[PDB]
């Protein structure tokens, strides 16, 4: 049903090597947002898309297999709905006061300091975040929570990170 | 003298707020790299410059002050010299086989696994890395080593962090 449409989508996007490259992902995300005039964006750039692919590429093939792509695509589908719901002035962007509500709706309850850091890193000079920056941020945030969770086997809220794992987790992202 | 020139050029670049934004940095790196055609590039994009600024913004103003800028600039100047030196076929690009000499000359000794990841994230389908990607990689890799070492004064090879700390450390595009 939806399982067959999705499988078709992935097959046609992934093409001859049966995995989704950064460039394939970039072209599809740009194709789709082009149809949503309520999402303001200067575009999905290659560098951003290589970042998204690396962070999602948990088997280190270089590209996104079916499950990796499914996980990402379904996140974006939920996250775009959130963005539109929380763009309560229809600017096409998420401003500083809209951001906490949006991230919280996505399951990320941060604190003022962390929201300010993300606005600082991801939002523009007026404190507005456009749609590709918003998705780029959430992919990584979601990945970073997941990485923490894997390392926190005993549920102490502290993790021990060796230098090798640190370099992999930050450089292959 | 060189010191006076550097201060003038920074003052001119930083303008009214006396700090260098990601957009200001993008513009000057694109203007300078165009004068060095041996450094082949598809350009410095805004996302890559926002990341550089973020990783260099140690007083969290959101932009690079004089000392933060100088430090990034001096690294870029050393690193461009290494890129030219280790580009032995003169392709304007750093191939997989040229990369470790270059990283070794920058002071970094990474295992094969980490090279594979960096090559997948930053080089093309032929294993060639262009100049903006080489610089983006090195600015990040340096910053990540420096971050880890700051938190591991004793050289245990490990750091311990909570979720807040982990997010502050990693939430870098
Ligand atoms: O449920 C799904 O898989 C959907 C996929 C989808 C929607 N439009 C598409 C266009 C192409 Br060319 C392929 C696949 C498409 S419909 S949900 C939706 C918005 C939505 C879903 N993913 C999005 C990504 C981006 Br970038 C922008 C908008 C997206 C809606 O109902 O509006
Ligand atoms: O060759 C040039 O264009 C140089 C420009 C230059 C020197 N000092 C500058 C200060 C600012 Br705020 C802007 C431009 C300046 S002199 S060579 C140099 C560094 C260097 C060499 N190649 C480079 C490429 C890129 Br992209 C960035 C810097 C590069 C230097 O003297 O530091
Ligand atoms: Ca493919
Ligand atoms: Ca993969
Ligand atoms: Ca808004
Ligand atoms: Ca954007
Ligand atoms: Ca400025
Ligand atoms: Ca600063
Ligand atoms: Ca070469
Ligand atoms: Ca490039």
Numbering used by the authors:
A (entry chain B), B (entry chain A): 96 to 268
What does the paper say about this structure?
Calpain-I and calpain-II are the two most studied members of a family of calcium dependent cysteine proteases that currently comprises fifteen identified gene products in humans. These heterodimeric proteases are composed of a large subunit with a molecular mass of ∼80 000 and a small subunit of mass ∼30 000. Selective inhibitors might not only be potential drugs but should act as tools to explore the physiological and pathophysiological roles of calpain-I. α-Mercaptoacrylic acid based calpain inhibitors are potent, cell permeable and selective inhibitors of calpain-I and calpain-II.
Compound 4 was then added to preformed crystals of PEF(S). The electron density map revealed that the ligand adopts two different conformations in each subunit of the PEF(S) homodimer, therefore a total of four conformations of the ligand were observed in the asymmetric unit of the crystal structure. The unique geometry of the disulfide bond is observed in all of the conformations ensuring that both pockets of the hydrophobic groove of PEF(S) are explored. One of the 6-bromoindole rings of 4 is bound in the hydrophobic binding pocket that also binds 3. The second indole ring of 4 interacts with a hydrophobic groove on the surface of PEF(S), where the α-helix of CAST inhibitory region C binds with PEF(S). A greater number of interactions form between 4 and residues of PEF(S) than with 3 and the protein, including a number of electrostatic interactions and hydrogen bonds. An electrostatic bond forms between the carboxylate group of 4 and the positively charged guanidinium group of Arg130. The dihedral angle of –91 in chain A is close to the optimum dihedral angle and in this conformation 4 makes strong interactions with both hydrophobic pockets of PEF(S).
